[PDB]
Amino acid sequence: RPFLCTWXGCGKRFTRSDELQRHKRTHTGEK
Ligand SMILES: [Zn+2]
């Protein structure tokens, strides 16, 4: 399952959901 970040134009795709969760932390708040 392509765990793709759907924030704005930040279409970064991940292989593991933890990677996407980790990544999403960047958008969730200031840094
Ligand atoms: Zn993103």
Task: Give the domain ranges of the chain.
Answer: 1-31
CA–CA distance, 3 with 25 (Å, rounded to integer) = 14
3 sits in the region (left: phi over 0; alpha: psi -120 to 50; else beta) called: beta
Question: Pick from 21, 26, 3: which is nearest to 12 by CA?
Answer: 3
Experimental technique of record: NMR
Question: What residues does 4 pair with on adjacent strands?
Answer: 13
User: How much distance in Å is there from the Cα of 21 to the middle of ligand 1?
Assistant: 10
Start-to-end CA span in the chain (Å): 26
User: How much distance in Å is there from the Cα of 11 to the middle of ligand 1?
Assistant: 6
Torsion angle in degrees (nearest 10) through CA of 31, 19, 10, 4: -150
Amino acid (one-letter) located at 23: H
User: How much distance in Å is there from the Cα of 1 to the middle of ligand 1?
Assistant: 17
**What are 17-21's contacts with CB under 8 Å, separation 24+?**
none
- Determine how many CB atoms are found less than 10 A away from the CB of residue 29: 6
User: How much distance in Å is there from the Cα of 31 to the middle of ligand 1?
Assistant: 11
